[PDB]
Amino acid sequence: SECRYLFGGCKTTADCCKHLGCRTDLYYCAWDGTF
After folding, report:
1. Which residues form each disulfide bond in the chain?
2. In this structure, is the dihedral angle defined by the CA atoms of residues 21, 26, 28 and 30, taken in order, positive or negative?
3. Are 28 and 17 in contact (CB under 8 A)?
4. DSSP state of 8
5. Which of 4, 9, 21, 35 could bridge to 30 as Cys pair (CB 3.0-4.6 Å)?
6. Residue 13: enclosing H or E segment and its boundaries?
7. Alpha-carbon span 31 to 18, nearest angstrom
8. Is the separation of the CB atoms in 4 and 15 below 8 Å?
9. What is the rounded distance in angstroms from the CA atom of residue 3 to the CA atom of residue 29?
10. 27 vs 14: CA distance, rounded Å
11. By the 8 A CB rule, do 3 and 16 touch?
């Protein structure tokens, strides 16, 4: 994996991988894969 695991303290979607979804309000990689 080349992305930060759940609660990786991200800032933007680019910070995480497709599998994850960096939230703008939570600011963390959300492991889901489907949005």
Report:
1. 3-17, 10-22, 16-29
2. negative
3. no
4. -
5. 21
6. none
7. 9
8. yes
9. 8
10. 12
11. yes
The residue behind tokens 């939570």 is 26
Confirm if 24 and 10 have CB atoms less than 8 A apart. no
User: Residue 25 phi/psi, 5° resolution?
Assistant: -95, -40
- Whole-angstrom distance, CA of residue 35 vs CA of residue 24: 14
In whole angstroms, give the CA distance from residue 1 to residue 26. Answer: 21
CA–CA gap between residue 1 and residue 24 (Å, rounded): 22
Spatial distance between the Cα atoms of 25 and 2, rounded to a whole number of angstroms: 23
